[PDB]
């Protein structure tokens, strides 16, 4: 798992904000990133902030961590980093706990969150599901990659619902999945026909493990 | 103690529901709140025009503090639409910008441009008149603006605490300082100690979206 030709195993990361590298301008405590199928990518950032003697939150008053900015996160070993996350800051919060510790928390979401903030009404006549999905995506200035379907419908109706919900319903009814990342949305059938990438062996590589069967499904 | 409304309805129907639910639904659709205490029930618009009662400063008075913004709950405009059969046409109303208390140096309109939805749209197929659509859209904008910043503060025992008043919050940076609206209070006395918690801001969800106030089909038989 550890990349080959790593001379030292020091892990590094980089946090860019509107193109500017702000890693060493603040005190960073923790970073978490989630990439799940059929969901919107998420990231959470925890920084140290607050001082009772000064009676202010200095990094909160800055212009680098306010809602609406583009955030990019990369990480790797020994100074060779790879892009992991790209999104926008949505939430901005402060916290002081019982024992006096104080921190600033940031919540970032992918660009596909633009699809989940309203209800719309539409008609489609003599089209396929792939065409309706591609059109709805393209109206939000995002790139679409939609595998074609074979069933042609006399009519499709979007009745007082969100774009995200309409897309997911029509995708699942055709046996396809949605993957969203890097200003791009891909709709396609699951990839179960490839070659394995790595081998994970219990007693060699693993730190924790859970697995389950259930016959009722 | 009910503040008067201006819209007169040809008919209102309470269909197989509880008194509390009917009252809360009709109150929220007019932009009003309900406060119940001491054998008395008051229905009125939120009190955001007064003078502050105290000053709570971080580094002076506070024992605990939480505060948060979220940009996804802010809108630029609201529209409401319906069908008028006497004219055989659609009818539309638009909301007006409400006047609220001043907190922070970012406006709701600036936060509304992160997602950049042109306008929120509400639709009903029945005969809803102009003034009712107007009140509906106004209530939605007020709902959205009163939930810009939310927070909670813990301090020592405060006998004169009250809800539906303003306080001044200071010592927390340019983006959170200002006048805040009190929504709730808790008093705790445990083993001789006394402290209070003060909640600021209102939640953004409608009442009917959180509770199940309609029966099941076939009466569940």
């Amino acid at each position: 798992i550890i990349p080959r030709n790593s001379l030292y195993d020091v892990a590094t990361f980089k946090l860019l904000s509107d193109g500017k590298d702000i890693t060493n301008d603040y005190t960073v405590l923790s970073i978490t990133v989630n990439q799940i199928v059929n969901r919107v990518p998420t990231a959470r950032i925890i920084l140290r902030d607050g001082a009772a003697a000064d009676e202010t939150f200095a990094a909160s008053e800055g212009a680098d961590l306010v809602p609406g900015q583009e955030v990019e996160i990369a990480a790797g070993y020994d100074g060779s980093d790879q892009k992991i996350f790209q999104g926008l800051i949505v939430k901005h919060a402060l916290k002081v706990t019982a024992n006096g510790d104080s921190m600033l928390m940031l919540d970032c979401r992918g660009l596909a969150t633009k699809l989940t903030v309203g209800r719309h009404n539409r008609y489609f006549v003599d089209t396929k599901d792939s065409d309706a999905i591609a059109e709805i995506i393209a109206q939000h200035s995002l790139s679409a990659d939609v595998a074609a379907t074979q069933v042609q419908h006399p009519e499709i109706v979007q009745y007082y619902a969100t774009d995200w919900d309409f897309i997911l319903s029509r995708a699942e009814m055709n046996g396809q999945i949605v993957v969203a990342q890097d200003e791009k949305i891909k709709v396609k059938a699951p990839n179960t026909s490839g070659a394995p990438q790595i081998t994970l062996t219990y007693g060699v590589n693993l730190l924790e493990l859970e697995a389950a069967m259930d016959a009722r499904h | 103690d009910v503040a008067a409304t201006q819209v007169q309805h040809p008919e209102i129907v309470q269909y197989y529901a509880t008194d509390w639910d009917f009252i809360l639904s009709r109150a929220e659709m007019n932009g009003q709140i309900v406060v119940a205490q001491d054998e008395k029930i008051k229905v009125k618009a939120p009190n955001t025009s007064g003078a502050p009662q105290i000053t709570l400063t971080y580094g002076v008075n506070l024992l605990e503090l939480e505060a948060a913004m979220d940009a996804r709950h802010q809108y630029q405009a609201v529209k409401a639409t319906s069908w008028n059969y006497a004219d055989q046409a659609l009818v539309e109303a638009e909301a007006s910008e409400p006047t609220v208390n001043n907190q922070g140096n970012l406006s709701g309109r600036q936060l509304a441009q992160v997602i950049d939805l042109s306008a929120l749209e509400l639709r009903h197929s029945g005969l809803v008149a102009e003034p009712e659509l107007k009140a509906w859209a106004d209530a939605q904008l007020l709902k959205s603006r009163l939930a810009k910043i939310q927070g909670r503060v813990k301090t020592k025992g405060y006998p004169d605490a009250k809800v539906d008043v303003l306080i001044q919050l200071a010592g927390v940076g340019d983006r959170f300082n200002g006048l805040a609206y009190v929504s709730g209070i808790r008093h705790e006395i445990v083993g001789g100690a006394w402290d209070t918690h003060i909640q600021m801001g209102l939640p953004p969800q409608w009442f009917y979206q959180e509770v199940d106030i309609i029966d099941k089909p076939a009466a569940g038989l």
Partner: protein, 37 residues
């Protein structure tokens, strides 16, 4: 928490109160987040 009804009620008078509070903010955050698209 940002709410007053989500606070844990204290019933004892003779003395780990700061671990029954951290293990309650974690569950509510794991459970709320489970409802967004």
């Amino acid at each position: 928490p940002l709410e007053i009804r989500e606070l844990v009620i204290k019933a004892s008078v003779n003395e780990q109160s700061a671990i029954i509070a951290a293990c309650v903010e974690q569950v509510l955050a794991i459970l709320q987040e489970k409802s967004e698209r």
